[PDB]
């Protein structure tokens, strides 16, 4: 039953209106956030919510494990768009512990196309595997990838020429990696930011133009 969703959206846009009437004509003149927001499409990440946002401030992209790759116009696009066209000031790479996307990666049914999707947090399982074997259980497993996951995607963002001509030219951009935690509601910093050319590895990073 969709009547739900349209009557939930004119009450909530009714009584917004009450509060503020010019609350969105005035958001509708402009688009600034100052943030975009990476995160996965499981539907307990709801980027807004879980930062205190309002509409106007979050750019947002979301997908299956928040995955980054450098073919991807989809993702890219949203990544172009808010560095140069929005300027946002920073770029919040989120992944979140008990992602199923990166559980499916550790074990070996097939899901279909959403197979070929995984296959960077695969590798990445691969190359962490002594790592990981040092795990007990499952669950600790999949959450510690998750980290890794985050931390590759925050590198996966900053090693992009988007993000180095926007640093080449001089703009403010840093690139944050955090996690997400379904069981408890706590967004949590890795501390992995990264903010100028200065940080990348001399095999990363490219000329100006
Ligand atoms: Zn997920």
């Keep these: 039953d969709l009547q739900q969703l349209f009557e939930n959206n004119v009450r909530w846009a009714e009584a917004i209106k009450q509060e503020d009437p010019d609350f969105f004509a005035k958001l509708a003149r402009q688009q600034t956030p100052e943030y975009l927001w990476i995160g996965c499409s499981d539907a307990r990440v709801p980027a807004n919510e879980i930062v205190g946002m309002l509409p106007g401030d979050l750019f947002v992209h979301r997908n299956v494990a928040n995955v980054v790759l450098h073919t991807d116009l989809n993702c890219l696009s949203v990544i172009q768009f808010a560095v140069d066209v929005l300027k946002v000031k920073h770029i919040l790479v989120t ?77 403010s951009l840093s690139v944050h990696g955090c996690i997400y935690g379904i069981k408890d509601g706590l967004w949590k910093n890795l501390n992995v930011t990264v903010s100028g050319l200065d940080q990348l590895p001399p095999q990363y990073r490219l000329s100006p133009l």
């Excluded at 963002?157 to 030219?169: G, M």
């Design 95 to 171: 992944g979140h512990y008990g992602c199923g996307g990166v559980r499916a990666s550790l074990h070996n049914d097939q899901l279909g196309l959403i197979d070929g999707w995984l296959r960077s947090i695969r590798d990445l399982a691969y190359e962490y595997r002594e790592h990981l074997e040092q795990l007990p259980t499952e669950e600790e497993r999949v959450d510690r990838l998750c980290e890794l996951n985050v931390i590759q995607q925050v590198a996966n963002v900053s090693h992009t020429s988007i993000v180095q001509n926007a640093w080449h030219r001089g703009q």
